Write a protein that binds this DNA or RNA. Sequence first.
DNA 1: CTAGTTGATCTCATATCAGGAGAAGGAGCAGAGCG
Lengths: 365, 1096, 252
Amino acid sequence: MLGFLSARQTGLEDPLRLRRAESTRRVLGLELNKDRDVERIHGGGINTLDIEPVEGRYMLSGGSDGVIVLYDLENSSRQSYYTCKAVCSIGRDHPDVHRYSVETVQWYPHDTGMFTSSSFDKTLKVWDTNTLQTADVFNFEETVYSHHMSPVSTKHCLVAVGTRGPKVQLCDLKSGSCSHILQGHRQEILAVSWSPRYDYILATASADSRVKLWDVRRASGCLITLDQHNGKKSQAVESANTAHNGKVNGLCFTSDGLHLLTVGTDNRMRLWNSSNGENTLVNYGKVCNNSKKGLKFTVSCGCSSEFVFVPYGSTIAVYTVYSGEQITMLKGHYKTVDCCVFQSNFQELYSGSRDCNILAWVPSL
Amino acid sequence: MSYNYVVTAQKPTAVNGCVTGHFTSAEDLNLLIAKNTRLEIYVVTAEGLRPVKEVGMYGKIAVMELFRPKGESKDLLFILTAKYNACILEYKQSGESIDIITRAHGNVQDRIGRPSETGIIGIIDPECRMIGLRLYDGLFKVIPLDRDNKELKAFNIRLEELHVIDVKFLYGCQAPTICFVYQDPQGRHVKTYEVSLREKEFNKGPWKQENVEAEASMVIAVPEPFGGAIIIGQESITYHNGDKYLAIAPPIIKQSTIVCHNRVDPNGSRYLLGDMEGRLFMLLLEKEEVTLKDLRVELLGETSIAECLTYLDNGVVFVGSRLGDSQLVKLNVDSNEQGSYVVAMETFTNLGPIVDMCVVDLERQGQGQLVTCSGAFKEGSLRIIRNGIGIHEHASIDLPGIKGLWPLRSDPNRETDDTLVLSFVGQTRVLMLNGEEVEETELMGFVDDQQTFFCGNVAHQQLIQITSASVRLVSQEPKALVSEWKEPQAKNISVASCNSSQVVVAVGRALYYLQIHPQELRQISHTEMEHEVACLDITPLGDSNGLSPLCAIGLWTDISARILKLPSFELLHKEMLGGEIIPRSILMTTFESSHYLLCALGDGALFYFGLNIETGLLSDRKKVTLGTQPTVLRTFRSLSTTNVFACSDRPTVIYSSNHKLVFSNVNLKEVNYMCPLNSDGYPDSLALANNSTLTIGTIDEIQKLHIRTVPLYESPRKICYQEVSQCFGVLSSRIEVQGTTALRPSASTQALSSSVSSSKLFSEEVEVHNLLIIDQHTFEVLHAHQFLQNEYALSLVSCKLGKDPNTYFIVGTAMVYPEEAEPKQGRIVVFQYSDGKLQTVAEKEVKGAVYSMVEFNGKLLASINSTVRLYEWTTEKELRTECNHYNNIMALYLKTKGDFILVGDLMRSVLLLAYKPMEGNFEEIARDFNPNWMSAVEILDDDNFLGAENAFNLFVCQKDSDEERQHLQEVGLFHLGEFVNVFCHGSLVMPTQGSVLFGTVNGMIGLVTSLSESWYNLLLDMQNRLNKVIKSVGKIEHSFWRSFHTERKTEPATGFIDGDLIESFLDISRPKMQEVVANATADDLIKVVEELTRIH
Amino acid sequence: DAEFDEGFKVPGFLFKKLFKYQQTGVRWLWELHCQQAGGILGDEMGLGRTIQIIAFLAGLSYSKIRRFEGLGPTVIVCPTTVMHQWVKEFHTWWPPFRVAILHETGSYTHKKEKLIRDVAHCHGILITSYSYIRLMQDDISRYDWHYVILDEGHKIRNPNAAVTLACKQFRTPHRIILSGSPMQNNLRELWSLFDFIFPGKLGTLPVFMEQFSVPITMGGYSNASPVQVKTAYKCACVLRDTINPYLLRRMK
DNA sequence: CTAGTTGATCTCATATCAGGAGAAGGAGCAGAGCG
């Protein structure tokens, strides 16, 4: 570290070197901080967490009990020990509270004033953070497994919604049109994720073992359908070209958006070229998931080497994205982990689980 | 909101990139040097370099390459900025006017992307079919050139290799072919692609991938005859052409890796290679009839540590250094008897990485004087920076009450000024000053009972003296006075004037014109004017015949600089000056373009006009107020041109550079009179008379801040000044290899006395760290205390602790072992410098690296790894902890004002801490919760905190105005473009509040100071309008350039005035000024901008 | 020559002949082509819509934008009474298009499948009737058509008719409708037309009905409760803005 | 071979108490092992 400081100070190395290297070192040293706690408010398992993209100060959390909690992640107290207090909460007494499990919650990108949340009550509610009141509701004919707003699109403000229907619903928060559907999957869509690189590229993963990339502008079906073998087992596309040998219940684009991570109930995680959907054949070993719903996992940002923090049973398994090497397994939960979210400002991780806890993992030293 | 003004006191000096080519003309050979934000254009003359232009980009030049598209007469320049502004620039010379026209521009930043490790690579196809940019991992951006854009539309090609080390375009390829080294987990490989602009994708390269060395880090494209590429690695140099595979492993290059290269020939039969040690190798390609036989490497010699190097011609090489002075070296065919062919021709001063610096009032004036820890491993040095011109006195003679100075050649044969005549009250005193010996003697032909208004050497090997009563023409060779003229009415002479040929004396209100001829003083022109005389000058300029045709006068009660026709004493021109103070000095001098008349008053006012040799008409009146006392003007011809000197309580050397007059300061107390002097021992020397003595000094550079250099030959890290001990404490670091052996004689090894740390606390190449005590007069290393094995000295403070009166050098260290990443051991050592020795007064084992130490109200405030703790200095002379604060990731930077501590963190950015003495512990007042990685911090006022973030930004935090009081508000934001290493209060000079200098990695010394709300609004408006009028080189918007920028944030600047942009308000023509100041008058804004320029 | 943002060189000696609204329409057609979506030139009769189409396709062919080097094989489905008019329009605006009519009158004098094969093999401009689409729905849709233009596309007004199914069996993303009135009776027709040009935008027909047609007509009666009319207005607004970037309609 | 006319054929619109007997399932529940 003193070598790094000296090399930054004298200009041998770009300051970029020290940032990325020290962030990587912090991530490798990621450990359950009993020096930080998250206030327990959910009566049920936390299905989803979302740190706001701008300023990374506030975090949303949706539980199976239907409540939403809005936490402050900044140590506003002068002590080195603090609890991430719950700022707001859509509780059992809020008139608009979800009737059933909140499966996904997402801050509006570009501003912290709005956030959207979907539930097994077949609703995607848009909330005004300041008033804490719903500003819009999108009813769907079938329960929502996942929704996602594009983190990049300054132009369109569509929400891709995956429900048990075989169709992917696109809901325009700009004047409200929830009619658009992308057809081509054959079973429930368990995950949707917009590319962080291209405004209109959407990757949708479903129960039929397929992941499809769509250009929602385009009127002609999916761009690419991810294939495990890239052509070794080639068939007229009616049943082949599966991304996994089971249900694909998780999606995540890498930070730069040039690759796609999909995790499926075949206990595999695969990395795909997001442009031509080619399997990069990164191994990753065996990534244990048996989730019957969407599995929310994240990648690191702004480190020398990219990581992926994937829920592995009751632990969080940390892998290197481009080599597969399992860095470590963060072990602090008591039931299966549903979601982990990465605070890229400080290389911190927050993981929620069915044990009704949100555990913060902070780098040690 | 905070209101700050940032200006550049010293422009960046570190050369981050240099190219050669035909840019200014098809026939010229130019050397273009990129210093961080400056582009310097030179011409490669037969000797040295002739500067032609120096332009400022609104961007850090990351890439800079010259290329000649088909049909173009001369090379165009492609520059990419760190913020990814691309531009193609052309050089257009229209007579005197010079322009750098932007043939094209754009911004090529992708909205997201991991900026690559090795950094922005920008390459051009040798057939100029495209520009390749490697900006992000997994992508390769292309700017087509055959399609003549003006917006530089660029498209990404996905590169399946994600860790690219280096990339070049290959030569002799039908289609654009890139060759790149990339790292995959299986090792490093060289691969090629063909870039298809029509299909906009990569294709199979001409020759398949090859597995190469583990540290293969550079690719060299070889021109057409050989083709292929040479990949330089840590241990080997290999060549690939697709079927041929040469490889060499010269042992001489194993010690250090080669970091830069340059093609000496057009056919690439020879390449220069520079390594991090500064060695310069020559890589030779031996051809066969053509194919390539073998590779050879020969060590040419040693240079500065090269960031880049360029071969100009005739064996002349420019060694551009970021870490040391850039060099201009020659390559001789034969060695110099020490094995080296390199011979340094010229050196360009580089304030290298200014890792630390202090403002010290050396020589006990009222002027600050920066001392900086500049440079790095071999190029380390202390640079001493001062304003002014430099007295450089050599001798003095205590002669109270001087009222005149004139140089004389007493020896007839010698043309040198080996005698000085002086007037004090009513008599004449002569001084011989033979060589260096000075004594007081009398020279024949001078009256010692009457005052000397004037005297000097004249033609015909004659001297002349104008006294208060008569004028005496001394025949130096034959005998004493033979021609003497006395006023017919025996009236006294009030003012005098004379040159090498003629004379003009003022008696009362009347002027007499005398012409000097052998054994004759003939009066021609005479008149009795309206009022009394004040000052005169008849010095010939552009003489060419022997006589001046004009005259300049100053009169009484009609205060004005008047002109006269010499043969007739008629009134040519009149300019009215006014005031109740008579003129004192009138001088006329050529300044680089034409004749100027310099007239001064008794209150320090001075007027300079443009004079014509035909009419004698004063035009383009401009006024300048220098000094608060009367002034006299004296002319001395330096190396370049004539440089008039203004003598007053505020001495100021006046000359002209770039056809504009500038007022450079002289920083001694006072100068009544001056005269030039070139004795056999004193060359081009001065003789500055004051009330007491005559200091005899020369002046070096008469223009900008002067930089001394004290070569340390080892990396300095910190520096603090001990006034009581008259020395600088400098932490230094040298590299030893083996027990251990110094690679060269460094400053630590060459101290007068020395010592080594003998501590009972703790029981390839390594860094040895020393504490150097350096004399603040001679800058010799009085002492060098070497620290423990594997001990890195990080911080150093000079202070008094507790109650005892001794001043200590206190050092914080850390124990660095290779098996660990963050030191767990370290110590605070207290030294006392006395009797030329450095005794160890105390020690204190801490459990971490002591990154930073500041004295805090008689207590020692250290920053051990993540804790900021306060120590008390007990009567027993040991350090005892008082209080701690632990809520830091890594408290790297500490500053103080009163009871408040500003803790700069590695990544949580600032923390306002207060030591509440009543309770005896720290209290977190406020914190900035943004994730800014600090490089330095500073406290401007009680509640404004300057900080430097590592992405080259400045921000100011402010204590706000409940729990939101613990949130520091970023009220100022500004992208400096520099990595600030150190802030320090002080100013380099004798409207703005406070003054903070800062030094950067690239060698910029900048200055931050606080403005008031009124001036801030005014200057911000000026800034907006100047942006509307000034045209940038790459057509980059100033607002975009100065926008706070980080990988996860981008906001416009605020609370900061770009002082460089404001001070450019003077370098524009008058109509443009009127365009700026449309909606008070322009001269008001001129007054403002000068008053702003005075602060640095 | 007039130039668009990404680069679509509509020739000057054609582009100058168009009127302002016609040039706006060519712009819009090409915005769709970039988005790879279809749309409805709903301009009512007499403005001239065939001119805009020939203009745009000619610009797309000359500009050589690319799949296909420039414009590929295109099929135009129009009523019999206007086919010959269409070919004349092409031949007077952009001659180099090898335009060919599929009809008993025709000009091929050989097997009609050989006409389809030849025209597709030459990237020609093939004109049919709706009946030939319906009859040869399996044969005509095998040659990778690059454009489908249903002139008077209100023949597709019924989502049940065999002509609608046969026309929706085309695969290309590029579907253009030239109809003076996209809907004539009710919103069945609008949905069918949009299901053609852009298969997914409006939902499946049940969803579209139950969201739009019923609330809307219930709000079209003067005895409707205030809530009903207010909901009708809201749903009409939602549909209007949903169809906005794909229906270009200009009145007189 | 070449048009043109004339039938047939098909597609697409526009309508709002005086049974009985047995077989199967299910539910209540007593009770016996037995984990």
